[PDB]
């Protein structure tokens, strides 16, 4: 994930000057796969668990993840059913949960500001609450069978009325609906069917979590997300489009601390990312080039030294040019000039020595007649 601002201006008024606001600034953003160091970690981990199931359905081999909790999946399902049965009758047990929260540093303020935009939705149904407990402590194929058998028993006994959300892409919601209409047939759990029934819930959960942010932050509309949430494609391509949406999320979060001031920049970046993945597959090596206003990001390059500063003096065409460039790093990919060996040299409170690399691109014009 390299986010670098390239600023071009003409003419050059001073050597090594501060670029004015009349310059053209373009932000080149490359975003890698995965985000375990940001606020989306508890999403990506779940997505990674999804990546297991999306593969477990494809090949049948389920490489289970480590359980992040103490209890097993079946115990969580049993107590989740018991509490909801108490809510429906003989019960409505109430819990009190007070936990200590604190800040680490002033950057935690921005981290929390980004976290609340991807916070768990205030409205959760039966399926997403089941998935939340089933996205961290499922380590065997027998657990899925036991959990779905418990759900079947609860639905048949008519003990609970699960809370549901619109869209009902998962078959379990349809099973609940048919249980609302009397008694249903006995559901069989064979092959990769138990994997797929659980997979169908995480897709809806992640789609709702995405939509609560895109429309919630006015960064995308239903039409903008229609191509990615379209159920006309197979489930593997649905997971692939979820991957693309998560990569767009990673693109946006990596740039929120920088261009938060202007809503236009955050909206244009989101639209460019959406239009890219509408017609292109998932690409992490692609560098998105967003032209940004130098006025809004003028405080970011007035406090940073340039990695490379270049002056190019030419006449008419750019075939004949004289370039003087200064780079704090090596601009050569086949040579390395000798920096001082920092062994037995300065290893104290004094700063390390730095040798700046200056390169002069000259040429010789030959007239062909």
């Amino acid at each position: 994930t390299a986010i670098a601002l390239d600023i071009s201006w003409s003419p050059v008024d001073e050597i090594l000057q501060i670029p004015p606001l009349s310059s053209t600034a373009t932000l080149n953003i490359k975003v890698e796969s995965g985000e375990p160091r940001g606020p989306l970690n508890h999403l990506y981990r779940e997505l990674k668990f999804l990546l297991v199931l999306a593969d477990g359905l494809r090949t049948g081999v389920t490489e289970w993840l480590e359980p992040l909790e103490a209890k097993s999946a079946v115990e969580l399902v049993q107590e989740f059913l018991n509490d909801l049965n108490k809510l429906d009758g003989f019960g409505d047990s109430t819990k009190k949960d007070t936990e200590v929260e604190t800040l680490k540093h002033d950057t935690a303020a921005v981290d929390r500001s980004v976290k609340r935009l991807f916070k768990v939705r205030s409205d959760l149904d039966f399926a997403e609450q089941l998935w939340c407990k089933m996205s961290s402590s499922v380590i065997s194929y027998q657990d899925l069978v036991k959990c779905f058998t418990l759900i079947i028993q609860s639905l048949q006994r008519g003990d609970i009325q699960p809370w549901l959300h619109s869209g009902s892409n998962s078959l379990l919601s349809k099973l609940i609906h048919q249980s609302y209409h009397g008694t249903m047939d006995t559901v069989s759990l064979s092959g990769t069917i138990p994997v797929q029934m659980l997979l169908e819930i995480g897709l809806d959960k992640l789609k709702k979590d995405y939509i609560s942010f895109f429309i919630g932050q006015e960064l995308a509309s239903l039409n903008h997300l229609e191509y990615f949430i379209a159920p006309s494609v197979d489930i593997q391509e649905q997971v692939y489009r979820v991957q693309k949406l998560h990569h767009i999320l990673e693109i946006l979060v990596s740039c929120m601390p920088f261009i938060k001031s202007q809503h236009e920049l955050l909206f244009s970046l989101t639209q460019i990312c959406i239009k890219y993945y509408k017609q292109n597959p998932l690409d992490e090596q692609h560098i998105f080039q967003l032209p940004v206003r130098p006025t809004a990001v003028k405080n970011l390059y007035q406090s940073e030294k340039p990695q490379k500063w270049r002056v190019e003096i030419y006449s008419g065409q750019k075939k004949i040019k004289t370039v003087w460039q200064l780079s704090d790093s090596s601009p050569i990919d086949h040579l390395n000039f000798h920096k001082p060996d920092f062994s037995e040299l300065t290893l104290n409170g004094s700063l390390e020595e730095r040798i700046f690399f200056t390169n002069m691109v000259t040429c010789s014009q030959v007239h062909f007649k």
């Binding site: 809510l87 009758g89 008519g158 609970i160 509309s221």
Partner: protein, 336 residues
């Protein structure tokens, strides 16, 4: 300007012949004034070369970062009329982009939305039709409707009408919805939503008379049948998903609608439908309603007492752990 004058730029601009490249560069710069001036100074230059691909390039160089106050007048008199007079075949994409652009105003703006959205969406239809200048030789000067009745233009017209009715709802009826919400509902559901925006039961009849009945009589709609259907939908949205029996928001909203009814036949059966959806036993307000409706006389009060003893046997069955309603015939002996 004169302060940017230079020989290298002057000769380069003189050698430039594709006048559209400068306009595209200005559009990408967000400088609409210079783009309009370059359009004006070269009106007859690219007129003989106007086709679909250059218009697509113009729309692609067009970005969503400029003010519409200097753009809408430019579309109404300069861009859209020129497209209509020169290439009517380009009226599709020019509409389609606009169909997106107005929808983009749903996210770019919220204060002037959808008034700015309406005035940008209507700019295609409100553009002047070239019918007064005298030249019948270039028969494409008349904007034929063979390209105005296409699917994209029809959808854009439907969107314009939807924006008109949306402004009517925002200002007059005080029913504020999203564009996608209004794109998938009907008059009955709009009536339901006007009550949905209302939370206080006391103001339900006042607003009903104020705007909802006016909307009703403007489209030949029924009052009491729609009130009963609203009660049914309120029951369905709560009781069907009711995991916890504390969603009493439907009872308070339904009592006011019951008070709004004028037909005695449609009151008792509405209360029965409340009975047939509420979980046995009901709450305190519903208990007051039942005791009230037992007191007056009606031929359906016998049906109400039938439903009352139905509630009693449901209470017995659910106190003995049998929660199914109306076991058919064979499990009666087993229950006994």
């Amino acid at each position: 300007g004169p302060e940017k004058f230079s020989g290298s730029s002057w000769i380069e601009f003189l050698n430039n012949e594709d006048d559209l490249k400068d306009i595209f560069l200005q559009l990408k710069e967000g400088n609409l004034v210079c783009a309009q001036y370059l359009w004006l100074r070269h009106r007859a230059n690219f007129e003989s070369r106007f086709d679909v691909k250059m218009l697509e390039s113009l729309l692609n160089s067009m970005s969503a970062s400029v003010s519409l106050q200097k753009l809408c007048p430019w579309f109404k008199n300069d861009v859209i009329p020129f497209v209509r007079r020169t290439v009517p075949e380009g009226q599709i994409i020019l509409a389609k982009w606009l169909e997106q652009a107005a929808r983009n105003l749903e996210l770019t703006d919220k204060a002037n939305w959808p008034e700015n959205g309406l005035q940008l969406a209507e700019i295609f239809f409100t553009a002047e039709k070239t019918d007064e200048l005298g030249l019948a030789s270039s028969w494409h000067w008349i904007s034929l409707k063979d390209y105005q009745n296409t699917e994209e233009v029809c959808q854009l017209r439907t969107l314009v009408n939807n924006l008109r009715e949306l402004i009517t709802l925002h200002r007059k009826y005080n029913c504020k919805l999203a564009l996608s919400d209004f794109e998938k509902e009907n008059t009955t559901t709009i009536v339901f939503r006007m009550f949905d925006k209302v939370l206080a039961p006391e103001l339900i009849p006042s607003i009903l008379e104020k705007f909802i009945r006016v909307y009703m009589r403007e489209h030949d709609l029924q009052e009491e049948e729609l009130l009963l259907l609203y009660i049914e939908d309120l029951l369905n949205r709560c009781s069907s998903k009711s995991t916890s029996l504390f969603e009493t928001a439907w009872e308070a909203k339904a009592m006011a609608v019951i008070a709004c009814l004028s037909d005695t036949d449609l009151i008792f059966d509405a209360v029965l439908k409340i009975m047939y959806a509420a979980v046995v036993p009901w709450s305190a307000a519903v208990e007051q309603l039942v005791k009230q409706h037992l007191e007056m006389d009606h031929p359906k009060v016998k049906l109400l007492q039938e439903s009352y003893k139905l509630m009693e046997m449901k209470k017995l069955l659910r106190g003995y752990g049998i929660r199914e309603v109306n076991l058919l015939n064979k499990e009666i002996m087993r229950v006994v």
